[PDB]
């Protein structure tokens, strides 16, 4: 992950740790928008067509290339790009939206629908899973007897 | 820069009798010349402005030319119209000037 | 529901920014442009006034936002192909005469 | 109506400064060209230069480049022309004049100062 | 092959081929639609065109009688008639 | 739209293309030709 | 997201569109070029003043365009990839639901 | 479809009645109509603003004005506080759905909250007119 969301408590102990990946590009903290001037000039004056002048008959009538006379350096060491992917580890008393997104999620065979996030999270079970499916849950409670 | 070439230096005149004072221009100013008439002890004084135009009460026989021939007409030369008549041109920053002398015979 | 959210927000948080920005940016070049005018030698008073309105700027040559571009924005070619493979006909029957 | 009233201190000794002033009323100082003319006397005239009042724009003549010194005040009404290094080619009659249609043009015209080095 | 390449055949020329057509008017109105019909009242299909090798002829074909109204598989049969206009007025 | 009426062709799938005859006859056919090309009047119009 | 209320929906009227991102202002002010007049047409005449006033006023109509097009970039960059990272989230809760 | 020209003879004039000229600072109100503006071929067209509907009495009422790829909008009150509201479209496109081609303008005017302007059925603007006082109309409409 990009960095890890850790959601505590009132006594500071992790209630539940969430992921965030990143997207892989490079990033540059030099804010590009705050140091750019617009160009008053030489841009002042774009159709979906660019192939237009392909023409497939003639470059089908063209011999292939047999009589090749190389170039003896044509070509250069490749160099492969190798990275390494930090993890920032954040620590916050308000529940992220990530948070919600892994609070909805079980592993449990057996499992409860909950609209109560803290509980959730804080289960003793830990069976309860966060739903916002209200009417869902009103249903289930009616036909509990 | 910009030089005006005034012809003739000096003319005589017979009263009542059209004459043609020619200003020469080294290069193209479109109308941006002026004439003007100065008098004995006196500070020139606007005839036409621009190629063509009418100014006040300014005799009404005057103003002609464009690029870089111009010429001042004077339909009925009289008594008063003695003097230096000058051009100059507004479209470049030299601010030149010629020079001719119209005397009446 | 949340595209909608977005452009109300470029309509209401970044636009007028934006046009703060921009009636700064054409009072500074109408000023310029009247003095430039009235500085000009070769012309009288009467075509310095017509020129100055010829060339004035106002607060309309700069009001770009059009919202149903903006809405046009998402309408890509891929959401195109999915409503037309998602919507609610299950059978349409059609029957014509070829020779 | 527009008048232009020029002062001048008109005699001076060789080597010497001088500062001629021209009054202007009857129309917004601060929207004309107003230029100086030198004319020595029985000869013609000789473009000096030009002030624009409303931000001091300077355009000279080479010949009077540093010979004449143009300035202008905008809450006076008044430009001024000075003459310094004074020599016996500089004893003439200086008029100020502005225009009043085309701007470069010298429609009305000042007493003129007749300065003696 | 279900796609028919149209041709411009001169007048006392054309005998007994295809030529009759329905046009359809599909929303102002600007889209326009062309189906052609022999002379015994049968579907030739709508006038689009078609891939020959490098050059899209103009075609009427059957399949767009297959696809469903504003589908987009018939912006391919759907026209533009311009006429000269003096708000447009370039050189014909 | 009118009858008798001259109307140059444009295809809504492609609008860049307009509608040229190769040849006159059954032996010929007529498809759809690009660019249109552009006509212009500087900082006025420039449509194609 | 605006989850401290007993109603959503009310508070997002309330509150407007903005409140539902955390990054609020981030636009930057882009730097213009200072507008200056060319100092030769002082003493052009009328007619050949005026077109050549018309090419500078759409040049100036063109850099609005391209101020306008910064804004919009901006906006796309620094304020929709927010709510693109809402959408994204939402049908993930969707299809975590419909699991469940 | 009616053509108007720029001949002071080429007009016309809608005589309202008395109860349906506007005067209010509350009333919202509501135009609609098919206009088709050729392509504009002068520089003069250039920043030139010119009124084709007008409904301004002593600079208070509604105008519908154009301009170069200008549709303008234009109201005021009896205190000379006005608001425009504007559709442009560019002279500068391959193809365009607005030059020469018949447009569905419509305008809304709600006194609370915004003036709006929709081209062929879509929303394309809105101006706040809320600060907009008492605003009298003209007792009469005119098309020049
Ligand atoms: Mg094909």
């Known amino acids: 992950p990009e960095e890890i969301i850790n959601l505590l408590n009132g006594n500071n102990v992790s209630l539940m740790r969430s992921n965030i990946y990143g997207d892989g590009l490079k990033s540059s903290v030099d804010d590009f928008y705050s140091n750019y001037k617009i160009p008053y000039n030489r841009a002042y004056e774009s159709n979906d067509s660019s192939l237009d002048n392909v023409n497939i008959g003639v470059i089908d009538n063209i011999p292939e290339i047999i009589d090749v006379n190389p170039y003896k350096e044509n070509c250069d060491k490749f160099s492969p790009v190798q990275k390494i992917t930090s993890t920032r580890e954040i620590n916050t008393n308000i529940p992220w939206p990530i948070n919600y997104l892994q609070a909805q999620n079980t592993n449990n065979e057996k499992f409860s629908l909950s609209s109560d996030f803290v509980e959730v999270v804080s289960s003793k079970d830990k069976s309860l899973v966060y739903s916002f499916l209200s009417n869902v849950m009103f249903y289930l409670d009616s036909i509990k007897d | 820069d910009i030089v005006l070439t005034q012809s003739p230096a000096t003319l005589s005149v017979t009263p009542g009798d059209d004459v043609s004072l020619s200003c020469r221009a080294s290069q193209s100013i479109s109308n941006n010349l002026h004439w003007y008439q100065q008098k004995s002890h006196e500070s020139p004084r606007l005839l036409i402005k621009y190629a063509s135009q009418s100014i006040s009460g300014i005799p009404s026989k005057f103003g002609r030319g464009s690029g870089t021939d111009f010429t001042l007409i004077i339909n009925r030369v009289e008594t008063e119209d003695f003097g230096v008549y000058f051009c100059q041109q507004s479209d470049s920053w030299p601010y030149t000037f010629g020079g001719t002398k119209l005397e009446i015979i | 529901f949340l595209n909608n959210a977005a452009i109300c927000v470029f309509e209401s948080n970044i636009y007028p920014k934006f046009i703060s920005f921009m009636e700064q940016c054409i009072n500074n070049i109408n000023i310029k442009t009247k003095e430039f005018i009235q500085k000009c030698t070769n012309i009288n008073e009467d075509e310095k006034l017509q020129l100055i309105n010829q060339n004035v700027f106002n607060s309309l040559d700069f009001e770009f936002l059009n919202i149903q571009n903006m809405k046009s924005l998402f309408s890509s070619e891929t959401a195109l192909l999915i409503k037309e493979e998602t919507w609610p006909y299950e059978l349409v029957l059609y029957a014509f005469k070829e020779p | 109506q527009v008048q232009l009233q020029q002062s001048g201190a008109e005699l001076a000794r060789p080597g010497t400064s001088v500062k001629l002033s021209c009054k202007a009323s009857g129309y917004t100082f601060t929207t004309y060209w107003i230029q100086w003319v030198k004319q020595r006397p029985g000869q013609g005239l000789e473009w000096i230069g030009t002030?624009?009042?409303?931000?001091?724009?300077?355009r000279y003549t080479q010949k009077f480049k540093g010979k004449a010194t143009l300035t202008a005040d905008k809450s006076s009404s008044t430009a001024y022309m000075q003459l310094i290094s004074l020599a016996s080619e500089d004893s003439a009659v200086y008029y100020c004049?502005?225009?009043?249609?085309?701007?470069?043009?010298?429609?009305?015209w000042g007493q003129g100062t007749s300065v003696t080095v | 092959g279900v796609e028919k390449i149209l041709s411009a055949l001169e007048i006392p020329d054309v005998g007994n081929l295809s030529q009759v057509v329905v046009m359809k008017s599909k929303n102002i109105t600007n889209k326009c639609k062309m189906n052609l019909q022999d002379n015994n009242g049968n579907d030739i299909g709508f006038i689009g065109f078609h891939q020959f090798n490098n050059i899209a002829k103009l075609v009427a074909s059957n399949w767009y009688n297959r696809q469903i109204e504003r589908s987009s598989r018939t912006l391919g049969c759907s026209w533009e008639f311009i006429p000269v206009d003096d708000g447009w007025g370039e050189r014909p | 739209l009118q009858y008798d009426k001259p109307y140059y062709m444009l295809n809504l799938y492609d609008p860049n293309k307009y509608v040229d005859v190769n040849n006159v006859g059954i032996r010929g056919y007529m498809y759809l030709k690009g660019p249109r090309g552009s006509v212009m009047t500087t900082n006025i119009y420039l449509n194609s | 997201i605006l989850n401290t209320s007993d109603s959503f929906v009310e508070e997002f009227q309330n509150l407007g569109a903005i409140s539902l991102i955390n990054k609020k202002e981030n636009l930057s002010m882009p730097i213009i070029e200072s507008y200056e007049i060319p100092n030769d047409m002082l003493g052009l005449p009328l007619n050949d003043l005026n077109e050549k006033l018309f090419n500078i006023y759409s040049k100036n109509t063109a850099y609005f365009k391209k101020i306008y097009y910064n804004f919009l970039d901006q906006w796309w960059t620094q304020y929709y990839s927010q709510y693109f990272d809402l959408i994204c989230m939402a049908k993930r809760s969707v299809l975590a639901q419909e699991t469940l | 479809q009616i053509q108007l020209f720029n001949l002071e003879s080429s007009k016309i004039e809608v005589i309202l009645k008395n109860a349906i000229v506007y005067n209010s600072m509350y009333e919202n109100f509501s135009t609609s109509f098919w206009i088709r503006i050729p392509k504009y071929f002068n520089s003069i067209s250039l920043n030139n603003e010119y009124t084709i509907i007008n409904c301004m009495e002593n600079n208070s009422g509604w105008k519908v004005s154009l301009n170069y790829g200008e549709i303008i909008w234009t109201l005021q009150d009896t205190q000379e506080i006005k608001q425009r509201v504007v559709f442009k479209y560019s002279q500068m496109i391959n193809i365009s759905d607005y030059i020469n081609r018949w447009i569905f303008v419509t305008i809304t005017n709600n006194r609370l909250n915004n003036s709006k302007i929709y081209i062929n059925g879509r929303l394309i603007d809105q101006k706040p007119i809320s600060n907009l006082g008492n605003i009298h109309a003209s007792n009469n409409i005119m098309f020049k």
């Open positions: 002030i624009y009042p409303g931000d001091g724009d300077t």
């Open positions: 004049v502005a225009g009043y249609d085309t701007s470069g043009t010298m429609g009305y």
